[PDB]
Amino acid sequence: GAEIYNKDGNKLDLYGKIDGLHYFSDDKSVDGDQTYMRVGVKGETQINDQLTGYGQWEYNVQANNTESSSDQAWTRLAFAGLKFGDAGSFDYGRNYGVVYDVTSWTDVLPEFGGDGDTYGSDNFLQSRANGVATYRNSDFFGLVDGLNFALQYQGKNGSVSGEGATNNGRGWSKQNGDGFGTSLTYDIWDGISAGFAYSHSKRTDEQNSVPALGRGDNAETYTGGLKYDANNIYLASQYTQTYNATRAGSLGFANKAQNFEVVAQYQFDFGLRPSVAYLQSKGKDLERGYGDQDILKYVDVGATYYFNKNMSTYVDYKINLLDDNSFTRNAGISTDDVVALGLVYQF
Amino acid sequence: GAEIYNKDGNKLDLYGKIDGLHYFSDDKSVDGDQTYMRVGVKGETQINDQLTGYGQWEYNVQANNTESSSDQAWTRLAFAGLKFGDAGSFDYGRNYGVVYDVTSWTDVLPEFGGDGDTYGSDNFLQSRANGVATYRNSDFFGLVDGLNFALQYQGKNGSVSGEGATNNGRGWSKQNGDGFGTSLTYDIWDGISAGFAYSHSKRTDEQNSVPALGRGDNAETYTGGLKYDANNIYLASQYTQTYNATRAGSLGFANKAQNFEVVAQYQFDFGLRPSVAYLQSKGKDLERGYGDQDILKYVDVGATYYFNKNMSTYVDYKINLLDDNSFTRNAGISTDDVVALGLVYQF
Amino acid sequence: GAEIYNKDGNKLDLYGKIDGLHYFSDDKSVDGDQTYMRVGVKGETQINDQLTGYGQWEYNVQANNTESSSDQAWTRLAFAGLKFGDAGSFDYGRNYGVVYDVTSWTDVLPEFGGDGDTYGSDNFLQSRANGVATYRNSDFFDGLNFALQYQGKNGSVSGEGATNNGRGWSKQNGDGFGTSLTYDIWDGISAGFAYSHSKRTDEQNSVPALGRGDNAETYTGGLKYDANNIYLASQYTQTYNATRAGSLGFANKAQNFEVVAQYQFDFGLRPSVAYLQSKGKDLERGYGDQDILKYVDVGATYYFNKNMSTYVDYKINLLDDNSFTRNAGISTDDVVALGLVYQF
């Protein structure tokens, strides 16, 4: 919310939040203060009757470290686009890959869930990504109400230097080759929705040489999801099968992985919203003797109290079901439980 | 000021400044361009008759280095809270330690003084800190006009890794253990005020093992202060005794220290505001032969001309009274004088 | 620019852009996604009848790398000032060196051109610079704009030559000054001259192999035609110890020429052609004379309206790949850019 400018067919929306947040956990890399804020601008300009231009920026600013600390802020989203009425829309920038058009349905926990769990950011087209061109079509050309599809292309984001480089190089875990993806979602009834998404990306030579885990020329995802949202009830599930595309912690990628998320929530009238969820990620055919391994496994219980549209408080309890083993230690995968308390101002 | 949004019980205040600033000094680490700007947002949401929610963010952006330089921006404040009428308020985030509810009375110099002098930031509850929970009460529940108090808790902010670590680790000089603090201020008249503050924090293992100077399990501060602010006159003093809490430059902490600051100012009607001040920090029982040492000692003379509420210019002259000795050289403590010239736009 | 506040003689203007931008090139350090945005504030406060105060901040934020990448944002402008009626103005902070009052006339390509090409940022008083005090005057106490500018030393990180805000030798400067003069001879036709003189630093005369001298200097002259939907402009600049010879140092002398032609169609298309070169002279290590920069530029911008545009730009690199270009890390490959831009 927060329209700070609306004049002569041009609109500007300032949005964000300040999330005062603490984690409690035996895992010392997670435990402690997690206060952060987000700030963003959504902009819109009417060009003619049939054509609207738009842009959006969203910035994450950590506030949990010192004034001399490093790397405390980063861009989540930055894209510009055109909306052609009901012929669709096109934008290019740092945006969400289309797979999240479906997996977002289970990304509604009070605090945990979403990117960092069964998938991450800069993880092919599974979450936020550098350099995505995205075509979106609403209601199948104004014909079939509730039917949305999207087509997406991502250019190579390669190594810092050497043969595989681009200008915007990173480490292997956040690299991609050329890739594409597609999503499709349908509101079969009101309240009920189904969705599919697919993605295919080339992998880079660094991804196939530097880490010990994961080999193949191509990274692929296949996703199906369901969602019930009505009568103060929210149910959703997401099942995703991946090839060479799911991080096996710090050790590389899983040659194959199966990811599952399900969540159930109720919204009481006085503002309380309890939540229970289950998330797992099962990795298959890992090298170096790892074989089949749990990448992620937890039950999640929590609640959010909404004071109003601008202020809320919440607790979330991640009940970790992973067994501590040599895979979890070497890959840096947490096996401890975590409680989160937070107080949030939003604008 | 600058209310850019006020609609349906939600308001948003965009504030900050642009400070065109040059230092002149024989100290090469201080001398030269010091231009920087501050930007922030104060937000408030009415929830119900008795309850208001709020948050606040403040960012510091250096502009005195190049476009390829590192670490030029950081968060000063980020916190969210609830105000329950005269039963008090609560907020959590990066915020001011309650000790500063008193020492702030002397932090009114044209340019110098404040953090970096007798205390710093991320320095237990002496200034801005990570992860403080702060309960405040004004006018003692509405029953005693001018009587304010605060109770504050701070979670451990530990090492980058090892046994003593938290998620948001930093170096020993900005670490803290679990700690609390309290403050109390009373307006005897509407210009004259007295105040006290206390804090107690656990020290971390790195604070006792890495630096040469300062040993103890606990950090403690006792602060009393006085203030006269009326009839265009401003007199203020603050006295603070510390234990294992005051930085001995880069060498560690002073086992005990005494800090004194006093300042007098006068506001002319045409907008000129002269200022004289005196500041010192005397460290005691330092290890390695140092014994008693001056940590800070200087006289300050300067003036601010206010063109209006949005624009000012100022000079400030720090006449440094430290002897250049082995302690000051080894601790990285400046012994040179400094002149500052500034032009400031504020919104 | 969007006026988000205007009350009681104080105005606040929020401005910026989101630039969805892709580069294509065989030069792998240039090729790929280049999406970035800029955000700024222009503030103005009325003080009295003869005096206004103001400040401006402009921030660059890259959006083409990951959420764990580092050094992805930096301040381009940050300055506060006073304007004394029409009798001119003064400001201090990070701002444009006065040389750009003239070279800005050729900095109008769809994408390429400007800082990074014949001159750079933090490059004495040629572009954006830390710690500039700038006095400006309209109508020379008529239509004749004058500026005088001083810059304090910005020196090394540590050692003899240090200041608080130390940096590498390529972006250092000593105490310096500059002056500019521009005039509208006819309506549409402008001419301009600019001079700068700065002390070099000890690191600039000791760490890089190229460029020796106590002082850096620039002489610039420029012309501009801007009427009847036509835009022509040129810039000729001579420099001593002031132009960068890539990563190797500075050029003892250099000659930089920039020229551009453009036309603005009513329906919003704006084709552009331009030529840029930088000729370095008297280089150490046997380099002698060398091209530092040489290319033709063709492209176009389509403006949907004042807030949205798309563009293509094609850099036709004419440099020959030789020992100087390789050692100094100067690109000799072509570049194509495609972008879509939202502006507020």
Numbering used by the authors:
A (entry chain B), B (entry chain C): 0 to 346
C (entry chain A): 0 to 140, 144 to 346
What does the paper say about this structure?
Data from OmpK36, which crystallizes in the monoclinic space group C2, were collected at a wavelength of λ = 3.54 Å. In total 12 sulfur atoms are found, from two methionine residues and two sulfates in the trimeric structure. For OmpK36, the analytical absorption correction (AC) gives equivalent merging R factors to spherical harmonics correction (SH), with an overall R merge of 0.119 for both. Notably, the AC strategy leads to an increase in the mean I/σ(I), from 16.42 (SH) to 21.37 (AC), and a stronger anomalous signal, as measured by the anomalous slope (1.69 with AC, as opposed to 1.31 with SH). AC generally gives better results than SH, with the exception of the heights of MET310 in chain B and SO4-1 in chain C, which are larger in the SH data. For both data sets, when employing the SH correction strategy, the resulting spherical harmonics terms are distributed over a large range (0.5–1.5).
